[PDB]
Amino acid sequence: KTTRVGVNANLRSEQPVAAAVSYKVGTAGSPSKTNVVDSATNSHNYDVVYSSTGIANPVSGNNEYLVDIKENGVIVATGKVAYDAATNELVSSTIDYKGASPVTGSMTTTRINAAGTTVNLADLGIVNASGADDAEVVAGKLYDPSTWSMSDYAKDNSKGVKPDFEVQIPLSDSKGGQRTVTLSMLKGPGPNQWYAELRAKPGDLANNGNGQISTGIIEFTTDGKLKNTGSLFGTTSPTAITIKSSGYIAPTVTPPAVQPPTPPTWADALGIDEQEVQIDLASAAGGLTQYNSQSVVQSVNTN
16 A cells, blocks of 8 residues: 655646636737837737636636736736626736836726836736626636636546646555546646646546545756745645545534635545645655656655
């Protein structure tokens, strides 16, 4: 029965972001938006890039997305937008000129320089005069760790998002059978940043259909060394996951405590025991690295 795994693999640092993670509005070979006039009567052509936050939407009643505004491949403005999850209206924007401080968002504009020149969000398609404000970002069908994920893709290849890289982790269960756990990852929009999911085979868990175990944002140093794993392993130390026994029922909580989301639980049919597994991504000889070389699994150690 597997209790500890060591992942030895490299993720190529120059791996380009997938369109499903960072979506440029419009057709290939032409700017997203043309002849956008700023408050100083100057016209621009802009690229508009919506990016997934890597954090499950909705957040406090809103669908949140990252936004970059680019001119000739240079970011002139950036921030986060939040659309009402029910009504699809823009609710808040932190889009401001790049490097701005303090960040000063607007429901109708963004600054494009420190001098305070602005453009209209509507001319960028971030707001919609003839429909739902979120129409153009919704068209991008962006990654979501909860509703449009790599685990969704594993279950149905027409759904969710295909990973940039995967590490398969074979577990021996309490019966000696082999359960495959997979670490699925996407290059994130941030520097040295990746979106990650841990997942069992779809159907191997009783508590969902796609087999997702956990999700998290993984960060690397500028030198390609693992920096942190976000909430991928929760707050465990050492980093670990626990998959509950077949037939495990979480007791009803006593109400200062709140009922935790149903934890990963082995399918009834498997009839196997709780499996707590340390997952070591930072060993001295190996570990999960992010150098500019081929994405590759060097080896996976198990006990």
